[PDB]
Design a binder for this molecule. Structure first.
Ligand SMILES: [Ca+2]
Ligand SMILES: [Ca+2]
Length: 142
């Protein structure tokens, strides 16, 4: 299973090649932060707990949690599709970089890990890549 993500910051999307650039003007009333999560290789019609974390990237490369959103979601027809997380309006600061991390954990056991054809382990998929520009926003200087 995989998760991929796109941050949408004041209506500006991240991409693999370019962080979402949020103008200082846009940031003055806070930054509306949403995230769309493309999942593949999950189990069709099964419930997952989806956790998104908006991380502030500090000068030393360490991360601190700004916002967290947890939803209860269901995998599609064929175990693939898109979920969303709306973090709402966030008070993000000029010159700073923020990145969205995502985790999905099946509510039930979905994996047999000991060849007895009984399910014993949850499926866990994560995307925790602070270098993924598609998940990254930067607040620009005035
Ligand atoms: Ca704004
Ligand atoms: Ca088993």
């Amino acid at each position: 299973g995989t998760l991929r993500s796109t941050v949408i910051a004041d209506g500006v999307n991240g991409s693999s090649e370019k962080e979402a650039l949020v103008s200082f003007e846009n940031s003055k009333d806070g930054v509306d932060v949403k995230d769309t999560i493309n999942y593949e290789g999950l189990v069709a019609n099964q419930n997952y707990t989806l956790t998104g974390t908006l991380m502030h990237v500090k000068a030393d490369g360490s991360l601190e949690e700004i916002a967290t959103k947890t939803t209860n979601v269901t995998a599609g027809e064929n175990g693939n599709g898109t979920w969303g997380l709306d973090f709402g309006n966030q008070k993000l600061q000029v010159g700073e970089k923020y990145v969205v991390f995502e985790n999905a954990e099946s509510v039930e056991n979905l994996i047999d890990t000991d060849k007895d054809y009984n399910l014993d382990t949850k499926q866990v998929v994560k995307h925790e890549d602070k270098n993924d520009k598609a998940q990254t926003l930067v607040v620009e200087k005035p």
